[PDB]
Amino acid sequence: ATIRVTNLSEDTRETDLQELFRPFGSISRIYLAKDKTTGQSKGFAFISFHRREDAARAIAGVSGFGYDHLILNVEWA
Amino acid sequence: GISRDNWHKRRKTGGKRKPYHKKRKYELGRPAANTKIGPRRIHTVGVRGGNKKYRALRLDVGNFSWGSECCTRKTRIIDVVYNASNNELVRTKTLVKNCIVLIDSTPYRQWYESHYALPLGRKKGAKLTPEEEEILNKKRSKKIQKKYDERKKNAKISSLLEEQFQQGKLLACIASRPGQCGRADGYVLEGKELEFYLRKIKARKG
Amino acid sequence: MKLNISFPATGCQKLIEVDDERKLRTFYEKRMATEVAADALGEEWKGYVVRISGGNDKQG
Amino acid sequence: MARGPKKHLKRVAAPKHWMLDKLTSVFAPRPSTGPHKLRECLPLIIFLRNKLKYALTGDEVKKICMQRFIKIDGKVRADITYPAGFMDVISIDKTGENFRLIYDTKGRFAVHRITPEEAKYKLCKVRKIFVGTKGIPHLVTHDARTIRYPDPLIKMNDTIQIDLETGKITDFIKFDTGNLCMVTGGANLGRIGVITNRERHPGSFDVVHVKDANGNSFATRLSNIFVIGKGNKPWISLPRGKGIRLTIAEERDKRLAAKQSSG
RNA sequence: GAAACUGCGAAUGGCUCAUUAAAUCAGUUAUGGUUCCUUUGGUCGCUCGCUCCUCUCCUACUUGGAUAACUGUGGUAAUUC
RNA sequence: CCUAUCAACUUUCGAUGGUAGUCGCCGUGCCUACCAUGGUGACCACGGGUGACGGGGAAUCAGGGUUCGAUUCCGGAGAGGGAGCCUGAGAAACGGCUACCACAUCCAAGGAAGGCAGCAGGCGCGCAAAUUACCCACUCCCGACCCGGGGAGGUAGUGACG
RNA sequence: CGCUACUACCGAUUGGAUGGUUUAGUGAGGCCCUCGGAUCGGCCCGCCGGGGUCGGCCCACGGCCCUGGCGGAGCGCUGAG
């Protein structure tokens, strides 16, 4: 499905997330909201998995898992 | 759909088989005819490998054979008195192979009296009065002597047969599948078999 | 709607546009076989008996 | 799946004794349905353009057939992959040449010209002799030809001269000990010889002890023995390679001696 | 001779090995337990006269009547509608 | 093939058998009545696992063995997942159908049409794998047919698997 | 006993996720089966056109019969539906 990720840093880009979400199955694509007028990575991302099982697994784990000294928040989009 | 295979169910060992392929047209195993008693309809059905199979829905006539005289006559089948496959079949009046049915006495008796030119006895008062007497008199003027020489130990037939004539119906056994053949044909019960079926009919009732 | 009225003696057919409610309404709740009177539509369909035969809805 | 029978056969999966190539063509001719089984058959095409070499395309093969210059068994065929078999005669009516198919003991189908006298008839062994419907008798030959009212003393494994002008039985030869046989299939392919003894075993499979002309003795199943006439009385000639049996050493000596000695 | 009806192919072909542990499958056997178009070979007048309606059942020098393609009018935002 | 840190198992929704019937192209607990209490295991059953399709075959080994097999051929199986069905001798068929479920598409919002584990190609995936090409002339297959159609198949291109 | 790093274990949160089995309930769809008659003709009763016969050998138009046309009566009664 599509899952939303929030509480991203501006030092956390698509590439940093790409390796992070591989133990929860292979991502199809990682879209990340950027605005270059203010900041870099706004704070919201949308990761798109190919399969429904893989997507749900991510939401469960990643929520409570630390990455760059912040608690990532993941939830169904 | 409705199914018929050996690659399902339990093993000898107490194991369980796991499928071989997915249901196929050959396995089809069509629902029952459920043919009973009422006005005749039969339908032609297209079945596997080509060929035509009759599906009977309602039958009420059969071709019942008198096996000790080697003649078969087409008669009514009015009811199921006994069936040994299931008791319910009798009650519901569903015709299946080996149903013990009731057929008319009168055509078999009429055939015998005419053919042998002497009556078995007297079936009934009503039966006697217009003809039976006619047959006894003979239409042979002339060739009376020929009949007497020809027929020895007649003016009678076997005890079991005579007893059934008195009842006004004869017990008969269905010797064909009424739902697949489309024929409810059978042979008239006689000797030991008739005695046994009457014993069963009496045993079950009451 | 447009009535596709055919005279089958001549083998002809034509459309006509009738949007007048009274002229139409006569043919409503008729089923394909039933006769109707076409007198409603004018003098030129007066004395005509019409057998409804079919047609097409909206969305085809 | 598999929802029905194949209508194709690949090459390099066809029977060896047809003498096709390996992988240089990806499809074999495949016999049509007919009187003989596809293993033992020889599609018309292989005979016509691979042995007698009258075509170098498939386009030509179809065009040849449509001329209808070819009769097979006295009857007029036009099938591109006709399922000819054992002692089936091919009749070219444009050249007056009659060829029959009989095994080499090498195991290769022989191109074996016969006279039009010997192409009048062929000897066919009875497969079943059948009391048919309404008490009319029939014999049925191996090549699935049913002849009604057959001679009233015949019994199983008899041979029967079938005639191809007019059909029907044109006498018969009775099955007896010491009859000529050609043993077909197996490890005894294309060998000719007498009988000697037929051993009978109740239940399936009965073996027939054969002795060949050389004096090599062997058994095979009755099924693999085909009766081709009366003992020491051929009705068609021996084919190339002896048709009896020859050793690989002898065969080498023939191959080198004949080659560069002709022309 | 476009078309259309009719008949046949369309189950074959090609692809991939997920599934399944005596299941599949291999080799050896069976169908006397059964179905099979086609091809190849036989089987092609008749009711054996309803003790000839079939000499009157006298349509045999041959019966009955409807759809396509076609022609015309059309509907649908969009359909191999 | 591996497993006892799987030792008892199979029928109340038949487990095995007798008898009789329904049903099926046809055998048969296939299904059902009635009637029996069977059937199977330390010679590993039963249960669990499995990148577990099977064979012909492949690689290395003195010999003995060990390892490999989706993959040019043969058999079986499936065509997004399930279930049902029509045609036909043969199909429970995705370049047929129908429903639902998961996916995707058009929409004027009423509706409507769909299945590349076919050939090319693209996306995703990864350490990993090619032309959106040309042709039915060959090789064969199909048809009413020599005549037509074929991503069957041939042909080139890509190609330091080797 | 101490720095540092990895791993298995136990763990509040009756943490979360996914897949397969499960009682019971509900149950699409098709198939089978009991019905139904939306629908259309056919064979019979009016007028005619032809033929024919029992108005009429003027046996001819026509009535009447047959069949075609067309409507109506019972829509009677068979088949399809």
Curated annotation (Swiss-Prot), chain A:
Q: Name one GO cellular component term.
A: cytoplasm
Q: Does the keyword Protein biosynthesis apply?
A: yes
Swiss-Prot/TrEMBL keywords:
Cytoplasm, Initiation factor, Nucleus, Phosphoprotein, Protein biosynthesis, RNA-binding
Q: Tell me what PTMs the record reports for this protein.
A: Phosphorylated. Phosphorylation is enhanced upon serum stimulation.
Tell me the compartments it is located in. Cytoplasm; Nucleus; Cytoplasm, Perinuclear region
- All residue ranges annotated as the RRM domain in the record: 1-77
Q: List the disulfide bonds.
A: none
An example Gene Ontology molecular-function term: RNA binding
Name its GO BP terms in alphabetical order: formation of cytoplasmic translation initiation complex; translational initiation; viral translational termination-reinitiation
Phosphoserine: residues bearing it? 26
Similarity section: Belongs to the eIF-3 subunit G family.
Q: How does it assemble?
A: Component of the eukaryotic translation initiation factor 3 (eIF-3) complex, which is composed of 13 subunits: EIF3A, EIF3B, EIF3C, EIF3D, EIF3E, EIF3F, EIF3G, EIF3H, EIF3I, EIF3J, EIF3K, EIF3L and EIF3M. The eIF-3 complex appears to include 3 stable modules: module A is composed of EIF3A, EIF3B, EIF3G and EIF3I; module B is composed of EIF3F, EIF3H, and EIF3M; and module C is composed of EIF3C, EIF3D, EIF3E, EIF3K and EIF3L. EIF3C of module C binds EIF3B of module A and EIF3H of module B, thereby linking the three modules. EIF3J is a labile subunit that binds to the eIF-3 complex via EIF3B.
Q: What is this protein called?
A: Eukaryotic translation initiation factor 3 subunit G
Swiss-Prot record, chain B:
Alphabetized PANTHER family for the sequence:
40S RIBOSOMAL PROTEIN S8 (PTHR10394)
UniProt modified residues of type Phosphoserine: 159
Which family would the database say this protein is a member of? Belongs to the eukaryotic ribosomal protein eS8 family.
Q: Which residues carry this modification: Phosphothreonine?
A: 129
Kindly give the Gene3D superfamilies that the UniProt entry links to this protein.
3.10.290.70, Ribosomal protein S8e, subdomain
Q: Which residues are listed under lipidation as N-myristoyl glycine?
A: 1
Q: Does the keyword Nucleus apply?
A: yes
Q: What kind of membrane protein is this, topologically?
A: Lipid-anchor
User: Region Disordered: start and end of each range?
Assistant: 1-26
Offer a single GO CC term for the protein: ribonucleoprotein complex
Q: Which residues form a coiled coil?
A: none
Source organism (scientific name): Oryctolagus cuniculus
- This protein is called what? Small ribosomal subunit protein eS8
The GO molecular function terms of this record are:
structural constituent of ribosome
Pinpoint the Glycyl lysine isopeptide (Lys-Gly) (interchain with G-Cter in SUMO2) cross-link.
169, 192
Quick one: a GO biological-process term for this protein?
Answer: translation
Q: Basic residues bias located where?
A: 7-25
- Protein's UniProt keywords contain Acetylation: yes
Q: Where in the cell is it found?
A: Cytoplasm; Membrane; Nucleus, Nucleolus
Listed under subunit, the entry gives: Component of the small ribosomal subunit. Identified in a IGF2BP1-dependent mRNP granule complex containing untranslated mRNAs. Part of the small subunit (SSU) processome, composed of more than 70 proteins and the RNA chaperone small nucleolar RNA (snoRNA) U3.
Record's function text: Component of the small ribosomal subunit. The ribosome is a large ribonucleoprotein complex responsible for the synthesis of proteins in the cell. Part of the small subunit (SSU) processome, first precursor of the small eukaryotic ribosomal subunit. During the assembly of the SSU processome in the nucleolus, many ribosome biogenesis factors, an RNA chaperone and ribosomal proteins associate with the nascent pre-rRNA and work in concert to generate RNA folding, modifications, rearrangements and cleavage as well as targeted degradation of pre-ribosomal RNA by the RNA exosome.
UniProtKB/Swiss-Prot annotation, chain C:
User: Is Isomerase given among the entry's keywords?
Assistant: no
In terms of superkingdom, the source organism counts as: Eukaryota
Q: Which GO terms describe its cellular component?
A: cytosolic ribosome; nucleolus; ribonucleoprotein complex
Which keywords are on file for this protein? Acetylation, ADP-ribosylation, Cytoplasm, Hydroxylation, Isopeptide bond, Nucleus, Phosphoprotein, Ribonucleoprotein, Ribosomal protein, Ubl conjugation
Coiled coil spans:
none
Family note: Belongs to the eukaryotic ribosomal protein eS6 family.
State the name under which the record lists this protein: Small ribosomal subunit protein eS6
Gene source species:
Oryctolagus cuniculus (Rabbit)
First and last residues shown, out of full length: 1 to 60 of 249
From Swiss-Prot, chain D:
- For this entry, list what GO says about its biological process: translation
Q: Which UniProt keywords apply?
A: Acetylation, Cytoplasm, Isopeptide bond, Nucleus, Ribonucleoprotein, Ribosomal protein, RNA-binding, rRNA-binding, Ubl conjugation
SMART domains (alphabetical): S4
As given in the record, the signal peptide range reads: none
Stored Gene3D superfamilies: 2.30.30.30, 2.40.50.740, RNA-binding S4 domain
Per the record, the domain of life is Eukaryota
Name the predominant localization: cytoplasm
Spell out the PANTHER family in the cross-references: 30S/40S RIBOSOMAL PROTEIN S4 (PTHR11581), SMALL RIBOSOMAL SUBUNIT PROTEIN ES4 (PTHR11581:SF0)
**Which protein, by its recorded name, is this?**
Small ribosomal subunit protein eS4
Q: What is the lineage of its organism?
A: Eukaryota, Metazoa, Chordata, Craniata, Vertebrata
